[PDB]
Amino acid sequence: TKVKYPDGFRSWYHVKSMVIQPGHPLENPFGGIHHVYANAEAIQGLRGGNYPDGAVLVFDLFDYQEDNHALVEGKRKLIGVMERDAKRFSATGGWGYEGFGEGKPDKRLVTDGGQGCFGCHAAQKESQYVFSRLRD
Amino acid sequence: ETKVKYPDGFRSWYHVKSMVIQPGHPLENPFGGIHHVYANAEAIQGLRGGNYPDGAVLVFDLFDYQEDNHALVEGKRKLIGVMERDAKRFSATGGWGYEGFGEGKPDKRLVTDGGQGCFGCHAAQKESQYVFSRLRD
Ligand code: HEC
Ligand code: HEC
Ligand SMILES: [Zn+2]
Ligand SMILES: [Zn+2]
Which CDD domains does the protein's record reference (chain B) (predicted)? Predict the structure, then answer.
């Protein structure tokens, strides 16, 4: 009952992006430029359906360099993953939560079953624990 | 065959990279905001270091942003910029056709000069076939 590394996530649908700058409540550890990616099953839930088992959402976080008032993507810091499985991850609302340092499969960041990730996402119970909304 | 096609479905293509251009940057007018670059399959072959087939398309998707408590949040789409590869049809501008679509709407074509203005800046990147964006992980 470990969350699987989402191989190939960079080929998935780009949901949205956001920049979190120093001073933001989530700066540690989510400071930087992040991109949200969704597999096919996750798109189904984002469009108004139920999230099927097998849905995966990825929070892809980069550092940025500020250069003459442009923010430029630097190195990947981590990915956060949410993997849908109603049965296996019922303790955390049907989603398994994991982080991978530098986006590497052997650098697992979560040490508490995903409880700390879940505690913040629980605020989005009404939208099946997902913050991100589909835009055009 | 003289016009760049609107790239229907580009939001489902591969996300190459992003960048933010803030006030004070030389390109804030007209490329200020958060932009994302997308590539179709044919464009990927070219970005990977292979050659660009005719039919390759690269999309520059530009959003305004809002400042919200040390976050930059995506606002309204300002425009999309499109490069469509056709070595024969678009030979006057280096084998790419250039178009801009206001607010990303198919009916709001922006380019009036056959893409010469667009090409004039892209011409500096001759050695990478007029493409600035690089693949990252
Ligand atoms: C609040 C204090 C949070 C904690 C702790 C965690 N996350 Fe979260 N997450 C948060 C917000 C406000 C957002 C939206 C970001 C945006 O661009 O709008 C997210 C997003 C995710 C995503 C993308 C899917 C979604 O819900 O929007 C993933 C995959 C994600 N978060 C995973 C994740 C993991 C693995 C966490 C513990 C290591 C975790 N999050 C904690 C807010 C908060
Ligand atoms: C310099 C003054 C430019 C003019 C005028 C135009 N473009 Fe360009 N473009 C420029 C840069 C520096 C970049 C890279 C942005 C990044 O994130 O690295 C781009 C990129 C594009 C792309 C993406 C493909 C690529 O070459 O990286 C497209 C599709 C694109 N630009 C199209 C485009 C059009 C249609 C233009 C005239 C309306 C145009 N550009 C002008 C720099 C400059
Ligand atoms: Zn402050
Ligand atoms: Zn600045």
Answer: cyt_c'_beta
